[PDB]
C-alpha cells in the first residue's frame, strides 16, 4: 500500500545488491544513477574511515541486522535531516553489504535494505515528502 516505502526499498535494495555483487521507473532510474555517482564517491573518499567503523560495530554486535538502523537513529538524533546524511548512511549500508557478501557469497542484502528503508520512510516520511522525495534527491545532487 505504501508507495513511498516500496519505491525507496526498490532503489536502496538495487543499489546495495549492485554494490555487493559488482554487477547491474524513470524516476527510480534517475535516483539510482544519482545514488551510484554520489554513493560510490562517499565510499571512495571515506573507505579508510568506513573500514575503521565496521570493525567496532562488529565487536559490539554485528549478527543483528539492526546494528545499522541504530547508527542511523543516532545520526539523526540531533534533529537534523538532510540529503547528505541520507546518502551517507545508504553508502555505509552498501559498504557493509559488500563486507557481508565477501564473507558469504550467499548473504542476502534485503534485510539490510529494509532496515535502512524503514528508518528513512517511517521516521522521516513528511520530510521526504516535503523535499519532493526521490525526485528531490536527484535534484539536490545533480550538477550538470
Amino acid at each position: 500500500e505504501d508507495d513511498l516505502y516500496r519505491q525507496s526499498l526498490e532503489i536502496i535494495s538495487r543499489y546495495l545488491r549492485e554494490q555487493a555483487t559488482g554487477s547491474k521507473g524513470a524516476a527510480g532510474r534517475r535516483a539510482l544513477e544519482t545514488l551510484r555517482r554520489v554513493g560510490d564517491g562517499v565510499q571512495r573518499n571515506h573507505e579508510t574511515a568506513f573500514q575503521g567503523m565496521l570493525r567496532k560495530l562488529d565487536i559490539k554486535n554485528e549478527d543483528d541486522v539492526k546494528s545499522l538502523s541504530r547508527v542511523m537513529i543516532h545520526v539523526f538524533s540531533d534533529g537534523v535531516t538532510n540529503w547528505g546524511r541520507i546518502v551517507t548512511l545508504i553508502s555505509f549500508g552498501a559498504f557493509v553489504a559488500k563486507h557481508l557478501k565477501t564473507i558469504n557469497q550467499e548473504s542476502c542484502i534485503e534485510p539490510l535494505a529494509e532496515s535502512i528503508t524503514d528508518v528513512l520512510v517511517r521516521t522521516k516520511r513528511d520530510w521526504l515528502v516535503k523535499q519532493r522525495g526521490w525526485d528531490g534527491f536527484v535534484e539536490f545532487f545533480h550538477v550538470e
Partner: peptide, 18 residues
C-alpha cells in the same frame, strides 16, 4: 565516535552541495 564522526562526513557532503 562512529555516530558524530558519519554525521562530519554527511553534513560537511551536505554543506559541498549547499
Amino acid at each position: 565516535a562512529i555516530x558524530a564522526x558519519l554525521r562530519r562526513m554527511a553534513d560537511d557532503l551536505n554543506a559541498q552541495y549547499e
